[PDB]
Structures are given as C-alpha cells and as structure tokens.
C-alpha cells in the first residue's frame, strides 16, 4: 500500500452488486462470487460485472481500491478537469493522470498499461 492509503478509513460496504443487483451468493451466472467495495463510497460490484481479470481482482482486494468515479490520482491525489482521461493500472487499478506519470505522458499508452508502482 501507499502511505496516504494506510489507515485512511474505508466506508461501510453495501452487500449488493450495483451492476447486476446480486449478492455474494449470486452473480450473473447464478454462482457465488465475493464482492469488492469502493473504499470511499462503499458501493460494490462482482469482479465479473466489473470485467476485472482474476489477477487484478486478487490485487485490488489487498489495496484501498476505489470505484471508477471515486478514483483519485495516486500521484497528485486530485480528480480535476482531466479526470475522464486518468489511466487505470492493469495490475493494481490505481489511477494516474497522464501528466502525473513517471515520466509524464503526452499520449495515451497503447494496450495493457502497468503503472510506475507496479512496473
């Protein structure tokens, strides 16, 4: 974890998937699947409804994971006017503004992208 994520309180999780309305007992394939929940708003989703790979799912369960809308840049801690184009790491799902990457990026990377923390 990052220092600013450590001991930063997490919201009460809602035990329903906001995408399919199932619980941990029933995803869209009518099979059990544990939810993941946003640390800031508490809303939840099945990893299969979020379209997360098994490997990404394992990693975000060990991190202070944020949903798409709550996601803040792991460098500058902001969302801001360029929020819609924040990159999401394909290893840890953290967000980074292109201009906050190391090195700063002028154009969107192509294909799978791994952030400066994971690379």
């Amino acid at each position: 974890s990052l220092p600013h994520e450590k001991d930063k309180p997490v919201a009460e999780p809602i035990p329903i998937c906001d995408f399919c309305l199932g619980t941990k007992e029933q995803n869209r394939e009518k099979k059990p699947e544990e939810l993941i929940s946003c640390a800031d708003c508490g809303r939840s989703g099945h990893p299969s409804c979020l379209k997360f790979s098994p490997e990404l799912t394992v990693r975000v369960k060990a991190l202070r994971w944020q949903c798409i809308e709550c996601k803040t840049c792991s460098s500058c801690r902001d969302q801001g006017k360029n929020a819609d184009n924040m990159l999401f790491c394909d290893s840890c799902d953290r967000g980074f503004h292109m201009e906050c990457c190391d090195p700063p990026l002028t154009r969107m990377p192509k294909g799978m992208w791994i952030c400066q923390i994971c690379r």
């Binding site: 329903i16 906001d18 995408f19 979020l50 798409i68 996601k71 924040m86 990159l87 990377p109």
Partner: peptide
C-alpha cells in the same frame, strides 16, 4: 490503456437507481 471513460463502457453502468440498494 484503460481510462475512466473506457471503464464506464466496460461495466455498462449501474442498474436503475430505484432498483439499487439504499
């Protein structure tokens, strides 16, 4: 790479508000 925009399209968006959990 994925962005906020592309991730939104991937989920298809939340279920309708009145059907969501309170």
């Amino acid at each position: 790479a994925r962005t906020k925009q592309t991730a939104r399209k991937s989920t298809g968006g939340k279920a309708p508000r009145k059907q969501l959990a309170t």
